[PDB]
Amino acid sequence: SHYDILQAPVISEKAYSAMERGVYSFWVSPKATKTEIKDAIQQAFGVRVIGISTMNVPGKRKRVGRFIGQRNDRKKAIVRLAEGQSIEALAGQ
Amino acid sequence: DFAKEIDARKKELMELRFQAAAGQLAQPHRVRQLRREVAQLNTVKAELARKGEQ
Amino acid sequence: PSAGSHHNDKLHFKKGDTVIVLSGKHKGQTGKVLLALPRDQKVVVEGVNVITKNVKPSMTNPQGGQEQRELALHASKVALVDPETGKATRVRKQIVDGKKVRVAVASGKT
RNA sequence: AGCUGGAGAUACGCUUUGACUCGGGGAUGUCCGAAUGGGGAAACCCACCUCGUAAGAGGUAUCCGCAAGGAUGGGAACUCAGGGAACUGAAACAUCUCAGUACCUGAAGGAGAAGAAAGAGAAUUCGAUUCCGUUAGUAGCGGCGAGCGAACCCGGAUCAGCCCAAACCGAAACGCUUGCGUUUCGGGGUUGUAGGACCAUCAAGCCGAAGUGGCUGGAAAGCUACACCUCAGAAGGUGAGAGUCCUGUAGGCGAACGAGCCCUGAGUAGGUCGUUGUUCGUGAAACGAUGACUGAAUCCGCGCGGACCACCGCGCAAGGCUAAAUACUCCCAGUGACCGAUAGCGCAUAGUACCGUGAGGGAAAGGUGAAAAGAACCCCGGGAGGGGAGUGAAAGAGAACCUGAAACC
RNA sequence: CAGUCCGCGGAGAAGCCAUACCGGAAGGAGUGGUGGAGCCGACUGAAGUGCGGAUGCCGGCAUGAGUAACGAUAAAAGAAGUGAGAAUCUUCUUCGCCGUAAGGACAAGGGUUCCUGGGGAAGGGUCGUCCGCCCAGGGAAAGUCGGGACCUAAGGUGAGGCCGAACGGCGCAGCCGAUGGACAGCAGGUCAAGAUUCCUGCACCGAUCAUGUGGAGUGAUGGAGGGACGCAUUACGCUAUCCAAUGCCAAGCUAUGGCUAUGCUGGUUGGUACGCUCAAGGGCGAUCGGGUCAGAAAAUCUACCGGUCUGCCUCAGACGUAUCGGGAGCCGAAGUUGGAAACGCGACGGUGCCAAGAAAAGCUUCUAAACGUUGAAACAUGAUUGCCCGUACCGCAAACCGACACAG
Ligand SMILES: [Mg+2]
Ligand SMILES: [Mg+2]
Ligand SMILES: [Mg+2]
Ligand SMILES: [Mg+2]
Ligand SMILES: [Mg+2]
Ligand SMILES: [Mg+2]
Ligand SMILES: [Mg+2]
Ligand SMILES: [Mg+2]
Ligand SMILES: [Mg+2]
Ligand SMILES: [Mg+2]
Ligand SMILES: [Mg+2]
Ligand SMILES: [Mg+2]
Ligand SMILES: [Mg+2]
Ligand SMILES: [Mg+2]
Ligand SMILES: [Mg+2]
Ligand SMILES: [Mg+2]
Ligand SMILES: [Mg+2]
Ligand SMILES: [Mg+2]
Ligand SMILES: [Mg+2]
Ligand SMILES: [Mg+2]
Ligand SMILES: [Mg+2]
Ligand SMILES: [Mg+2]
Ligand SMILES: [Mg+2]
Ligand SMILES: [Mg+2]
Ligand SMILES: [Mg+2]
Ligand SMILES: [Mg+2]
Ligand SMILES: [Mg+2]
Ligand SMILES: [Mg+2]
Ligand SMILES: [Mg+2]
Ligand SMILES: [Mg+2]
Ligand SMILES: [Mg+2]
Ligand SMILES: [Mg+2]
Ligand SMILES: [Mg+2]
Ligand SMILES: [Mg+2]
Ligand SMILES: [Mg+2]
Ligand SMILES: [Mg+2]
Ligand SMILES: [Mg+2]
Ligand SMILES: [Mg+2]
Ligand SMILES: [Mg+2]
Ligand SMILES: [Mg+2]
Ligand SMILES: [Mg+2]
Ligand SMILES: [Mg+2]
Ligand SMILES: [Mg+2]
Ligand SMILES: [Mg+2]
Ligand SMILES: [Mg+2]
Ligand SMILES: [Mg+2]
Ligand SMILES: [Mg+2]
Ligand SMILES: [Mg+2]
Ligand SMILES: [Mg+2]
Ligand SMILES: [Mg+2]
Ligand SMILES: [Mg+2]
Ligand SMILES: [Mg+2]
Ligand SMILES: [Mg+2]
Ligand SMILES: [Mg+2]
Ligand SMILES: [Mg+2]
Ligand SMILES: [Mg+2]
Ligand SMILES: [Mg+2]
Ligand SMILES: [Mg+2]
Ligand SMILES: [Mg+2]
Ligand SMILES: [Mg+2]
Ligand SMILES: [Mg+2]
Ligand SMILES: [Mg+2]
Ligand SMILES: [Mg+2]
Ligand SMILES: [Mg+2]
Ligand SMILES: [Mg+2]
Ligand SMILES: [Mg+2]
Structure with missing residues (x-):
């Protein structure tokens, strides 16, 4: 319904340093539009989105064994919440 | 009632995907096992759809 | 690319069956079927000693080991034995229910 | 009883309340594409209408028809049809041939076409259509040149002929000075030795007979001493050459669901003008075939028998349907005095790499070993490479891994 | 290659390699050496059956030869680092070379070449510890920028429609189609790598709703205006922007023979809000009424026709106050005076010319129909909403087109 939309949280030092600021970022399905992913976050974690x-x-495009290929195309999506931020406490721990 | 169990499966499935982007994924089998329970779910629903209504 | 089963992915032995070797230096030696790989025709019995060497590898350890291990073989062991060793196998005798096709040489089972 | 795709790699696990894998159905099936809500530079943009909680589902192109319900597009070769070459031969070259070949385009199926005599033909025989053999390079056509080339008889493969208009009854709706006639429905009616009216099994699969000791060897299937089975000695695997180790083979069984035998056709027959097909190039040129202009006859009637006439024979046109024998081979099995890595399909795989704006062109191919036992460990070197050691029958096999010829160094 | 015999073979086949032997030749044997799995001899049958040549084909290897060159004559030198190894990689200090470029920003077009950490086979005309190369992992954020959810030119389509052996050729409306019209924000900060996107400050836009004022008229696929356009010259004000100084501010020295600062070096404002502040330049006349024959009919809106009396609007930009930034520098100073000056802004200015210079929606104004006229149009505040695609990097070139790290 919408859990399927959220492909994976983005890893990396920048997404962590933003996660310290209360903004959160994840990869989502390339077909996904802004409204449905805002609603999917507001469903999946219960916070209100305030920015997107x-x-x-x-x-x-990477190659193994003289076989050259395109890799899957992602769609990164970053969102800021209102003052009830903190998401689920799945930070760096 | 079927959709409730479907979506309950979908939530933990996405939770497993979220950990899998991270270093934690000790039981990958639970991944695919969670999906067949979805498919069986949907399948059985269709198996009721034709039944009775004909 | 040549499948290696001219024997139709059939196997004349179960896993855990006691077995004797027909050919090679192991002819006349004895062993239970520890691993049965049908489509490749590979058969593991205890006693097919082979000295695999490796302390080059890091993953097990910065060194490693020479060590004794099994070397799986072709369905060139005798599949099943009895107080008479070797020998062929009749089937289709009935179990106590009859639902189990079984085995015999001159006569017997398993 | 293993499975967890190639894929060779770890971890996570599924399975004897039946996994996998194999046959059979179901159910999901994103977007493009005939694409079809509308747009568009395919695979992406933008909408509307009902369900209406929402996530989500369904509809929204055109053509034929009331309405079901059809159609659009694709398909290697094969079929039919609308158009229709030129090199070339003619030792030049116009008619001719090359050829209704190649090609384009349309329709369609597992075939298609054609087909149930207004015929062939010369015995007053034949009796649908298609295909093979033959007649036969006979007849014949041809700047009578290059060359082009039938048909009947006869022999086979396969053989089924079935249905409607129309004279006449019952209208019914409509057409007129009054028991009548334009197109609709049932009856009836389908022809030439004239007929007809109206009046006398294969699928997934299971079972399946029979050998042991010694020898060489690294290894046994070779050799050897004795045997056994055979409705099975086809074949492939196994450390090398196995009827008797495996898988099979001969034979036998085998399924809930599964595929498969007074009338008889007119703007036409006929004709003139332009043309054309069969051997038919204006030739004495019949006949079919149609563009233009015309335009008959009815059963004491009509078409043909190669200008034309009389006689003598064959046959009834202007409405339709019709299996099979016939063609091909994208695909499957079987087989081979077929190839075996420059051969053989281009490909031991790839329409890839590469070349081209494009249509399009277009490669090299391979081999450890029995089994990975795929070289622990030590030495010189960052390496790479190498020497020892081991594994192995062989390292005179070591991954630039069968042999390893010649140029050449 | 095939049929049939004879046989051979891991105590080792074919193949490869030497060889003084043998037949008249094509040829064939003996022995030895590799090789490691099939094969000779005889009789017969069939052939893709015998190579030095075809500027033959596929392939490998020679000669030229350690020869020509190493891709602009904008030179490079020392220290110090790294390192198995350095003329070439890193850093430091000098040097030289472009500077309407050889700097910067875009469009194409390319597609991860961007950043970080690693690597060293091959690509780099030498090297290579380095790279635009190999590996892995990150970076790419928009209601306001460009496009789309708007419009139209050429052009392409195209129900109907006109034609044409077929396929198809045209073709009104409509539709597509930017290269054009239309449209809401600027100043600053910063990852290793993004920025009118994110963050910070403060604006604007449209939409929905609420509170209230107002408390009623809205006012179309149709009419009308307008949007709507040429070239050359040229007057006035101004900004960007640059110059000067014994203006201010900031920091320190100096020495060579001198200057003791009036010397040297560097800086010397961006946005926003508010003004009884200064301001060139620019625009605009204004209603009442008549006629049907004009805009399909309508119309209070346009056009035609008659009567009627310098002024308004406007800010380009400057100046002040505030504020928010930035700011040389060792957290934050100063911000002056004079001048120069755009193709930019005021503007759709003036004047001259002839070759006589898009369309369309948005937009302003009218009624038709319809909806109401005690929950209008509009306005004010609050809240709520803000979709899709693009954005890294190269981008006069080592990352695009030239087969190349190419003098184009
Ligand atoms: Mg945002
Ligand atoms: Mg490589
Ligand atoms: Mg070593
Ligand atoms: Mg494997
Ligand atoms: Mg479409
Ligand atoms: Mg279309
Ligand atoms: Mg000629
Ligand atoms: Mg000619
Ligand atoms: Mg053809
Ligand atoms: Mg065709
Ligand atoms: Mg068709
Ligand atoms: Mg014997
Ligand atoms: Mg055999
Ligand atoms: Mg004629
Ligand atoms: Mg003639
Ligand atoms: Mg080949
Ligand atoms: Mg070769
Ligand atoms: Mg090919
Ligand atoms: Mg390629
Ligand atoms: Mg090596
Ligand atoms: Mg060697
Ligand atoms: Mg060798
Ligand atoms: Mg090797
Ligand atoms: Mg071999
Ligand atoms: Mg070799
Ligand atoms: Mg020998
Ligand atoms: Mg010789
Ligand atoms: Mg061998
Ligand atoms: Mg041979
Ligand atoms: Mg030849
Ligand atoms: Mg010669
Ligand atoms: Mg030659
Ligand atoms: Mg050559
Ligand atoms: Mg010289
Ligand atoms: Mg030289
Ligand atoms: Mg030169
Ligand atoms: Mg230097
Ligand atoms: Mg020094
Ligand atoms: Mg050092
Ligand atoms: Mg080196
Ligand atoms: Mg230093
Ligand atoms: Mg530049
Ligand atoms: Mg681009
Ligand atoms: Mg870089
Ligand atoms: Mg780096
Ligand atoms: Mg290198
Ligand atoms: Mg080099
Ligand atoms: Mg450099
Ligand atoms: Mg965006
Ligand atoms: Mg913003
Ligand atoms: Mg725009
Ligand atoms: Mg057209
Ligand atoms: Mg346009
Ligand atoms: Mg533009
Ligand atoms: Mg704007
Ligand atoms: Mg930082
Ligand atoms: Mg930048
Ligand atoms: Mg000019
Ligand atoms: Mg001075
Ligand atoms: Mg008004
Ligand atoms: Mg300019
Ligand atoms: Mg329009
Ligand atoms: Mg940029
Ligand atoms: Mg990009
Ligand atoms: Mg060139
Ligand atoms: Mg260049």
Whole structure:
């Protein structure tokens, strides 16, 4: 319904440093629109979204064994919440 | 009632995906096992749809 | 690319069956079926000693080991024995229910 | 009883309340594409209408028809049809041939076409259509040149002929000076030795006979001493050459669901003008075939018998349907005095790499070993490479891994 | 290659390699050496059956030869680092070279070449510890920028419609189609790598709703205006922006023979809000009424026709106050005076010319129909909403087109 939409939280030092600021970022399905992902976050974790941005990301084109191939195209999506932030306490721990 | 158990499966499935992006995923089998329970779910629903109504 | 089963992914032995070797230096040696790989025709019995060497690998340890291990073999062991060793196998005799096709040489089971 | 795709790699696990895998159905099936809500530079943009809680589901192109319900597109070769070459031969080249070939385009199926005599033909025989053999390079056509080339008889493969208009009854609706006639429905009626009216099994699979000791060897299937089975000695695997180790083979069984035998057709027959097909190139040129202009006859009637006439024979046109024998081979099995890595399909796989804006062109191919036992460990070197050691029958096999010829160093 | 015999073979086949032997030749044997799994001899049958040549084909290897060159004559030198190894990689200090470029920003077009950590086979015309190369992992954020959910030009489509052996050729409306019209924000900060996107400050836009004022008229796929456009010259004000100084501010020295600062070096404002502040330049006349024959009919809106009396609106930009930034520098100073000056802004200015210079919606104004006229139009505040695609990096070039890290 909408749990399927959220492909994975973004890892990496920048997403963590933002996660310290109360904004959260994850990869979502490339077909996903801004409204449905805002609603999917508001369903999946119960916080209100207050800001959004998204960015399609073609995969790095990589090669193994003289077989050259495109990798799956992601869609990163970053969102800021109102003062009831903190998401579920799944931070860096 | 079927949709409730479907979506309850979907939530933990996405939780497993979220850990799997992280270093924690000790039981990958639970991944695919969670999906067949979804499919069986949907399948059985169709198996009732034709039944009775004909 | 050549499948290696000219024997139709059939196997004349179960896992855990006692078995004797027909050919090679192991002819006339004895062993239970520890691992049965049908489509490849590979058979593991205890006693097919093989000295695999490795302390080059890091993963097990910065060194490692020479060590004694099994070397699986072709369905060139005798599949099943009896007080008479070797020998072929009749089937289709009935179990106490009859639902189990069984085995015999001159006569017997398993 | 294993399974967890190739894929060779770890971890996580599923399975004897039946996994996998194999046959049979179901159910999901994102977007493009005939694409079909509308747009568009395919796989992406933008909507509307009902369900209406929402997530989500369904509909929204055009053509034929009331309405079901059809159709659009694709398909290697095969079929039919609308158009229709030129090299070339003619030792030049116009008619001719090359050829209704190649090609384009349309329709369609597992075939298609054609087909149930207004015929062939010369015995007053034949009796649908298609295909093979033959007649036969006979007849014949041809700047009578290059060349082009039938049909009947006869022999086989396969053989089924079935249905409607129309004279006449019952209208019914409509058409007129009064028991009548334009197109609709049932009856009836389908022809030439004239007929007809109206009046006398294969699928997934299971079972399946029979050998042991010694020898060489690294290894046994070779050799050897004795045997056994055979409705089975086809074949492939196994450390090398196995009827008797495996898988099979001969034979036998085998399923809930599964595929498969007074009338008889007119703007037409006929004709003139342009043309054309069969051997038919204006030739004495019949006949079919149609563009233009015309335009008959009815059963004491009509078409043909190669200008034309009389006689003598064959046959009834202008409405339809019709299996099989016939063609091909994208695909499956079987087989081979077929290839075996420059051969063989281009490909031991790839329409990939690469070349091209494009249509399109387009490769090299391979081999440890029995089994990975795929070289622990030590030495020189960052390595790479190498020497020892081991594994192994062989390291005179070591992964630039069968042999390892010649140029050449 | 095939049929049939004879047989051979892990005590080792074919194949490969030497060889003084043998037949008249094509040829064939003996022995030895590799090789490691099939094969010779005889009789017969069938052939893709015998190579030095075809500027033959596929392939490998020679000669030229350690030869020509190493891709602009904008030179490079020392220290110090790293390291198995350095003329070439890193850093430091000098040097030289472009500077309407050889700097910067975009569009194409390419597609991860961007950043970090690693690597060293091959690509790099030498090297290589380095790279635009190999590996892995990150980076790419928009209600306001460009496009789309708007419009139209050429052009392409195209129900109907006109034609045409077929496929198809045209074709009114409509639709697609930017290269054009239309449209709401600027100043600053910063990951290793994004920025009118994110963060910070403070604006605007449209939409929905609420509170209230107002408390009633809204006012179309149709009419009308307007949007709506050429070139050359040219007057006035101004900004960007640059110059000067014994203006201010900041920091320290100096020495060579001198200057003791009036010397040296560097800085010397961006946005927003508010003004009885200064301001060129620019726009605009204004209603009453008549006629049907004009805009399909309507119309209080346009056009035609008659009567009727400098002024308004406007800020380009400057100046002040405040504020928010930035700001040389060792957290934060100063912000002056004079001048120069755009193709930019005021503007859709003036004047001259002839070759006589898009369309369309948005937009302003009218009624038709319809909906109401005690829950209008509009306005004010609060709240709520803000979709899709693009954005990394190269981008006069080592990352695009030239088969190349190419003098184009
Ligand atoms: Mg945002
Ligand atoms: Mg490689
Ligand atoms: Mg070593
Ligand atoms: Mg495997
Ligand atoms: Mg579409
Ligand atoms: Mg379409
Ligand atoms: Mg000629
Ligand atoms: Mg000619
Ligand atoms: Mg053809
Ligand atoms: Mg065709
Ligand atoms: Mg068709
Ligand atoms: Mg014997
Ligand atoms: Mg055999
Ligand atoms: Mg004629
Ligand atoms: Mg002639
Ligand atoms: Mg080949
Ligand atoms: Mg070769
Ligand atoms: Mg090919
Ligand atoms: Mg490629
Ligand atoms: Mg090596
Ligand atoms: Mg060697
Ligand atoms: Mg060798
Ligand atoms: Mg090797
Ligand atoms: Mg071999
Ligand atoms: Mg070799
Ligand atoms: Mg020998
Ligand atoms: Mg010789
Ligand atoms: Mg061998
Ligand atoms: Mg041979
Ligand atoms: Mg030849
Ligand atoms: Mg010669
Ligand atoms: Mg030659
Ligand atoms: Mg050559
Ligand atoms: Mg010289
Ligand atoms: Mg030289
Ligand atoms: Mg030169
Ligand atoms: Mg230097
Ligand atoms: Mg020094
Ligand atoms: Mg050092
Ligand atoms: Mg080196
Ligand atoms: Mg230093
Ligand atoms: Mg530049
Ligand atoms: Mg681009
Ligand atoms: Mg870089
Ligand atoms: Mg780096
Ligand atoms: Mg290198
Ligand atoms: Mg080099
Ligand atoms: Mg450098
Ligand atoms: Mg965006
Ligand atoms: Mg913003
Ligand atoms: Mg725009
Ligand atoms: Mg057109
Ligand atoms: Mg346009
Ligand atoms: Mg533009
Ligand atoms: Mg704007
Ligand atoms: Mg930082
Ligand atoms: Mg930047
Ligand atoms: Mg000019
Ligand atoms: Mg001075
Ligand atoms: Mg008004
Ligand atoms: Mg300019
Ligand atoms: Mg319009
Ligand atoms: Mg940029
Ligand atoms: Mg990009
Ligand atoms: Mg060139
Ligand atoms: Mg260049």
